[PDB]
Amino acid sequence: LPDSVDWREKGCVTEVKYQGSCGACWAFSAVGALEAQLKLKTGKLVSLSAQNLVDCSTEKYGNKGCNGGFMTTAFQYIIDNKGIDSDASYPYKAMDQKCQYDSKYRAATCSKYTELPYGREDVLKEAVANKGPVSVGVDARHPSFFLYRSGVYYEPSCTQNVNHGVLVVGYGDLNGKEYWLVKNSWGHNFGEEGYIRMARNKGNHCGIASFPSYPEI
Ligand SMILES: N#C[C@]1(NC(=O)[C@H](CC2CCCCC2)NC(=O)N2CCOCC2)CCN(Cc2ccccc2)C1
């Protein structure tokens, strides 16, 4: 496997988004993963609608819109629905709204998704290298997480009780510290222009490899 990977270098990662006061991280994580596959498949990089998931992948999928959701069930909604609209056609409002999906604005489809084995950082490395960015959940409730600015994030108080959906878009090594390159959805002001390098091969730190999954087209 490559020693390092950065899907941004392959033009497979869209701009960092700002979720605001709506707990839609799960939807942003999910569209981010599909965005990479859509690019790999069609050659075009297109932001997908996080709002479409918030408003439509709801109760039937165990999701609660601005109050939380799952990347896997969001993927299943896209499969069941036979599509997801583009972000431009169905903009993000950081609010729960009525479902307004319209196939005329469809920008991507999904045929299946895969959930990786719990806590295997080696399997996650292989997936990130051979398949593309992977949706994951991390424990981002510690004060240090909100204040992260640079370097590789390692928090002794971190746990494997995850609560925030993000996207691994690569991995590597910085000054002797292995890390996972994570795309967050708290805008460009957060961390490194919206990204955070989180400790890799450090005992499933913050549960980064606890619940990984990726869609395919
Ligand atoms: N956005 C998103 C949130 N998380 C979710 O949506 C998480 C995401 C999942 C991804 C897969 C692994 C487990 C977690 N889900 C979640 O909270 N649910 C799941 C569905 O029922 C409602 C609650 C909403 C609440 N969270 C609060 C928070 C604040 C600060 C730091 C971390 C988490 C952030």
Coordinates of all heavy atoms in Angstrom, one line a residue, residues 19-29 61-73 92 115 135-142 145-146 161-166 184-186 207 210-213, ligand 1:
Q19 N -21.7 23.1 8.6 CA -23.0 22.6 9.0 C -23.8 23.6 9.9 O -25.0 23.4 10.0 CB -22.8 21.3 9.7 CG -22.3 21.3 11.1 CD -22.0 19.9 11.7 OE1 -21.3 19.1 11.1 NE2 -22.6 19.7 12.8
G20 N -23.1 24.5 10.5 CA -23.8 25.5 11.3 C -24.4 24.8 12.6 O -23.8 23.9 13.2
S21 N -25.6 25.3 13.0 CA -26.2 24.8 14.2 C -27.1 23.6 14.0 O -28.0 23.3 14.8 CB -27.0 25.9 15.0 OG -26.1 26.7 15.6
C22 N -26.9 22.8 12.9 CA -27.7 21.7 12.6 C -26.7 20.5 12.6 O -25.7 20.5 12.0 CB -28.3 21.8 11.2 SG -29.0 20.4 10.5
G23 N -27.1 19.4 13.4 CA -26.2 18.3 13.6 C -26.3 17.4 12.4 O -26.8 16.2 12.5
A24 N -25.9 17.9 11.2 CA -25.9 17.1 10.0 C -24.6 16.5 9.5 O -24.4 16.2 8.4 CB -26.4 18.1 8.8
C25 N -23.6 16.4 10.5 CA -22.3 15.9 10.2 C -22.5 14.5 9.4 O -21.7 14.3 8.5 CB -21.5 15.7 11.4 SG -22.2 14.6 12.7
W26 N -23.4 13.7 9.9 CA -23.6 12.4 9.2 C -23.9 12.5 7.8 O -23.4 11.8 6.9 CB -24.7 11.6 9.9 CG -26.0 12.4 9.9 CD1 -26.4 13.4 10.8 CD2 -27.1 12.2 9.0 NE1 -27.7 13.8 10.4 CE2 -28.1 13.1 9.4 CE3 -27.3 11.3 7.9 CZ2 -29.4 13.1 8.7 CZ3 -28.5 11.3 7.3 CH2 -29.5 12.3 7.7
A27 N -24.7 13.5 7.4 CA -25.1 13.7 6.0 C -23.9 14.2 5.2 O -23.7 13.9 4.0 CB -26.3 14.7 5.9
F28 N -23.1 15.1 5.8 CA -21.9 15.7 5.1 C -20.9 14.6 4.9 O -20.3 14.5 3.9 CB -21.3 16.8 5.9 CG -22.1 18.1 5.7 CD1 -22.8 18.7 6.8 CD2 -22.1 18.8 4.5 CE1 -23.6 19.8 6.6 CE2 -22.9 19.9 4.3 CZ -23.6 20.4 5.3
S29 N -20.7 13.7 5.9 CA -19.8 12.6 5.8 C -20.2 11.7 4.7 O -19.4 11.4 3.8 CB -19.7 11.8 7.1 OG -18.9 10.6 7.0
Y61 N -35.1 5.5 8.1 CA -33.6 5.2 8.1 C -33.0 5.4 9.5 O -31.8 5.3 9.7 CB -32.9 6.1 7.1 CG -33.4 5.7 5.7 CD1 -34.5 6.3 5.1 CD2 -32.8 4.6 5.1 CE1 -35.0 5.8 3.9 CE2 -33.3 4.1 3.9 CZ -34.4 4.7 3.3 OH -34.9 4.2 2.2
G62 N -33.8 5.6 10.5 CA -33.3 5.8 11.9 C -32.6 7.1 12.1 O -31.9 7.3 13.1
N63 N -32.8 8.0 11.1 CA -32.1 9.3 11.2 C -33.0 10.4 11.8 O -34.3 10.2 11.7 CB -31.6 9.7 9.8 CG -30.5 8.8 9.3 OD1 -29.7 8.3 10.1 ND2 -30.5 8.6 8.0
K64 N -32.5 11.4 12.3 CA -33.2 12.5 12.9 C -32.8 13.9 12.5 O -32.8 14.9 13.2 CB -33.1 12.4 14.5 CG -33.6 11.1 15.1 CD -33.2 10.9 16.5 CE -33.7 9.6 17.1 NZ -33.6 9.6 18.6
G65 N -32.4 14.0 11.2 CA -32.1 15.3 10.6 C -31.0 16.1 11.4 O -29.9 15.6 11.6
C66 N -31.4 17.3 11.8 CA -30.5 18.1 12.5 C -30.2 17.6 13.9 O -29.3 18.2 14.6 CB -31.0 19.6 12.6 SG -31.0 20.5 11.0
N67 N -30.8 16.5 14.3 CA -30.5 15.9 15.6 C -29.7 14.6 15.5 O -29.7 13.8 16.4 CB -31.8 15.7 16.3 CG -32.4 17.0 16.9 OD1 -33.4 17.5 16.6 ND2 -31.6 17.6 17.9
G68 N -29.1 14.4 14.3 CA -28.3 13.2 14.2 C -28.7 12.1 13.2 O -29.9 12.0 12.9
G69 N -27.7 11.4 12.7 CA -28.0 10.3 11.8 C -26.9 9.4 11.6 O -25.9 9.5 12.3
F70 N -27.0 8.5 10.6 CA -26.0 7.5 10.3 C -25.6 7.6 8.8 O -26.4 7.7 7.9 CB -26.6 6.1 10.5 CG -27.1 5.8 11.9 CD1 -28.4 5.6 12.1 CD2 -26.2 5.8 13.0 CE1 -28.9 5.4 13.4 CE2 -26.7 5.6 14.3 CZ -28.0 5.4 14.5
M71 N -24.3 7.4 8.5 CA -23.8 7.4 7.2 C -24.3 6.2 6.4 O -24.8 6.3 5.3 CB -22.3 7.5 7.2 CG -21.7 8.8 7.5 SD -21.5 9.1 9.3 CE -20.0 8.0 9.6
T72 N -24.3 5.0 7.0 CA -24.7 3.8 6.4 C -26.2 3.9 5.9 O -26.5 3.4 4.8 CB -24.6 2.6 7.2 OG1 -25.1 2.8 8.5 CG2 -23.1 2.2 7.4
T73 N -27.0 4.4 6.8 CA -28.5 4.4 6.4 C -28.7 5.5 5.4 O -29.7 5.3 4.6 CB -29.4 4.6 7.7 OG1 -29.2 5.9 8.3 CG2 -29.0 3.5 8.8
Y92 N -28.2 23.6 1.3 CA -28.2 23.4 2.7 C -28.6 24.6 3.6 O -28.1 25.7 3.5 CB -26.8 22.9 3.1 CG -26.6 22.6 4.6 CD1 -27.2 21.5 5.1 CD2 -25.9 23.5 5.5 CE1 -27.1 21.2 6.5 CE2 -25.8 23.2 6.8 CZ -26.4 22.0 7.3 OH -26.3 21.7 8.6
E115 N -19.4 -1.7 5.1 CA -19.0 -1.3 6.5 C -17.7 -2.1 6.8 O -17.7 -3.3 6.7 CB -20.1 -1.5 7.5 CG -19.6 -1.3 8.9 CD -19.6 0.2 9.4 OE1 -20.4 1.0 8.8 OE2 -18.9 0.5 10.4
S135 N -16.2 7.2 5.1 CA -17.0 7.8 6.1 C -16.7 7.2 7.5 O -16.6 5.9 7.5 CB -18.5 7.7 5.9 OG -18.9 8.4 4.7
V136 N -16.4 7.9 8.5 CA -16.1 7.4 9.8 C -16.8 8.2 10.9 O -17.2 9.3 10.7 CB -14.6 7.3 10.2 CG1 -13.8 6.5 9.1 CG2 -14.0 8.7 10.2
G137 N -16.8 7.6 12.1 CA -17.3 8.4 13.3 C -16.1 8.5 14.2 O -15.3 7.6 14.3
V138 N -15.9 9.7 14.9 CA -14.9 9.9 15.8 C -15.4 10.5 17.1 O -16.6 11.0 17.1 CB -13.7 10.9 15.3 CG1 -13.1 10.3 14.1 CG2 -14.3 12.3 15.0
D139 N -14.7 10.4 18.2 CA -15.1 11.0 19.4 C -14.6 12.4 19.3 O -13.4 12.6 19.5 CB -14.5 10.2 20.6 CG -14.7 10.9 21.9 OD1 -15.4 11.9 21.9 OD2 -14.2 10.4 23.0
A140 N -15.4 13.3 19.0 CA -15.0 14.7 18.9 C -15.5 15.6 20.0 O -15.6 16.8 19.8 CB -15.4 15.3 17.5
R141 N -15.9 15.0 21.1 CA -16.5 15.8 22.2 C -15.5 16.5 23.2 O -15.9 17.2 24.1 CB -17.5 15.0 23.0 CG -17.1 13.6 23.3 CD -18.1 12.8 24.2 NE -18.6 11.6 23.6 CZ -19.8 11.3 23.3 NH1 -20.8 12.2 23.6 NH2 -20.2 10.1 22.8
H142 N -14.2 16.3 23.0 CA -13.2 16.9 23.9 C -12.8 18.3 23.5 O -12.7 18.6 22.3 CB -12.0 15.9 24.0 CG -12.4 14.6 24.5 ND1 -12.7 13.6 23.6 CD2 -12.8 14.1 25.7 CE1 -13.2 12.5 24.2 NE2 -13.3 12.8 25.5
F145 N -10.4 19.1 20.7 CA -10.8 18.9 19.3 C -11.2 20.2 18.6 O -10.8 20.5 17.5 CB -11.9 17.8 19.2 CG -12.2 17.4 17.8 CD1 -11.6 16.3 17.3 CD2 -13.1 18.2 17.0 CE1 -11.9 15.9 15.9 CE2 -13.4 17.8 15.7 CZ -12.8 16.7 15.2
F146 N -12.0 21.0 19.3 CA -12.5 22.2 18.8 C -11.4 23.2 18.6 O -11.5 24.1 17.7 CB -13.6 22.8 19.8 CG -14.7 21.9 20.1 CD1 -14.7 21.2 21.4 CD2 -15.8 21.7 19.3 CE1 -15.7 20.3 21.7 CE2 -16.8 20.8 19.7 CZ -16.8 20.1 20.9
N161 N -16.0 5.9 22.1 CA -17.4 6.2 22.0 C -17.6 7.3 21.1 O -17.5 8.5 21.5 CB -17.9 6.6 23.4 CG -17.7 5.4 24.5 OD1 -18.2 4.3 24.3 ND2 -16.9 5.7 25.5
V162 N -17.8 7.0 19.8 CA -17.9 8.1 18.8 C -19.2 8.8 18.7 O -20.3 8.3 19.0 CB -17.5 7.5 17.4 CG1 -16.1 6.7 17.5 CG2 -18.5 6.5 16.9
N163 N -19.1 10.1 18.2 CA -20.3 10.9 18.2 C -20.4 11.9 17.0 O -21.3 12.6 16.9 CB -20.4 11.7 19.5 CG -19.0 12.2 19.9 OD1 -18.4 13.0 19.2 ND2 -18.5 11.7 21.0
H164 N -19.3 11.9 16.2 CA -19.2 12.9 15.1 C -18.8 12.2 13.8 O -17.8 11.6 13.7 CB -18.3 14.0 15.5 CG -18.2 15.1 14.6 ND1 -19.3 15.8 14.1 CD2 -17.2 15.7 14.0 CE1 -19.0 16.7 13.3 NE2 -17.7 16.7 13.2
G165 N -19.7 12.4 12.8 CA -19.4 11.8 11.5 C -18.5 12.7 10.6 O -18.8 13.9 10.5
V166 N -17.4 12.1 10.1 CA -16.5 12.9 9.3 C -16.0 12.0 8.2 O -16.5 10.9 8.0 CB -15.2 13.3 10.2 CG1 -15.7 14.4 11.2 CG2 -14.6 12.2 10.9
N184 N -13.6 17.7 8.0 CA -14.7 18.0 8.9 C -15.7 18.8 8.2 O -15.6 19.2 7.0 CB -14.1 18.7 10.1 CG -15.0 18.8 11.3 OD1 -16.1 18.1 11.3 ND2 -14.7 19.6 12.3
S185 N -16.8 19.2 8.9 CA -17.9 20.0 8.3 C -18.2 21.2 9.1 O -19.4 21.5 9.3 CB -19.1 19.1 8.0 OG -19.7 18.5 9.1
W186 N -17.2 21.8 9.7 CA -17.4 23.0 10.6 C -16.7 24.2 9.8 O -16.2 25.1 10.5 CB -16.8 22.8 12.0 CG -17.5 21.8 12.8 CD1 -18.6 21.1 12.6 CD2 -17.0 21.2 14.0 NE1 -18.9 20.2 13.6 CE2 -17.9 20.2 14.5 CE3 -15.8 21.5 14.8 CZ2 -17.7 19.5 15.7 CZ3 -15.6 20.7 16.0 CH2 -16.5 19.7 16.4
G207 N -11.6 6.4 18.3 CA -12.5 5.5 17.6 C -12.6 5.7 16.1 O -13.5 5.3 15.4
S210 N -13.5 2.8 14.2 CA -14.6 2.0 14.9 C -15.8 1.6 13.9 O -16.2 0.5 13.8 CB -15.2 2.8 16.0 OG -14.3 2.7 17.1
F211 N -16.3 2.6 13.2 CA -17.4 2.4 12.2 C -17.2 3.1 10.9 O -17.8 4.0 10.5 CB -18.7 2.9 12.9 CG -19.0 2.3 14.2 CD1 -18.8 2.9 15.4 CD2 -19.6 1.0 14.2 CE1 -19.1 2.3 16.6 CE2 -19.9 0.4 15.4 CZ -19.7 1.1 16.6
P212 N -16.2 2.5 10.1 CA -16.0 3.1 8.7 C -16.9 2.4 7.7 O -17.2 1.2 7.8 CB -14.5 2.8 8.5 CG -14.0 2.0 9.7 CD -15.3 1.5 10.4
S213 N -17.2 3.2 6.7 CA -18.0 2.7 5.6 C -17.8 3.5 4.3 O -17.5 4.7 4.4 CB -19.5 2.7 5.9 OG -20.0 4.0 6.2
Ligands
LIG1 N1 -23.3 16.8 13.5 C1 -23.5 15.5 13.9 C2 -23.7 14.9 15.2 N2 -23.5 13.4 15.4 C3 -24.2 12.6 14.7 O1 -25.0 12.9 13.8 C4 -23.9 11.1 14.9 C5 -23.1 10.5 13.8 C6 -22.8 9.0 13.9 C7 -21.9 8.5 12.8 C8 -21.6 7.0 12.9 C9 -21.0 6.6 14.2 C10 -21.8 7.2 15.4 C11 -22.1 8.7 15.2 N3 -25.2 10.4 15.1 C12 -26.1 10.8 16.1 O2 -25.7 11.6 16.8 N4 -27.3 10.1 16.1 C13 -27.6 8.9 15.4 C14 -29.1 8.9 15.0 O3 -29.9 9.2 16.1 C15 -29.7 10.5 16.6 C16 -28.3 10.6 17.1 C17 -25.0 15.3 15.8 C18 -24.8 15.3 17.4 N5 -23.3 15.3 17.5 C19 -22.9 16.3 18.5 C20 -21.4 16.6 18.6 C21 -21.0 17.8 19.0 C22 -19.6 18.1 19.1 C23 -18.7 17.1 18.8 C24 -19.1 15.8 18.5 C25 -20.5 15.6 18.3 C26 -22.8 15.7 16.2

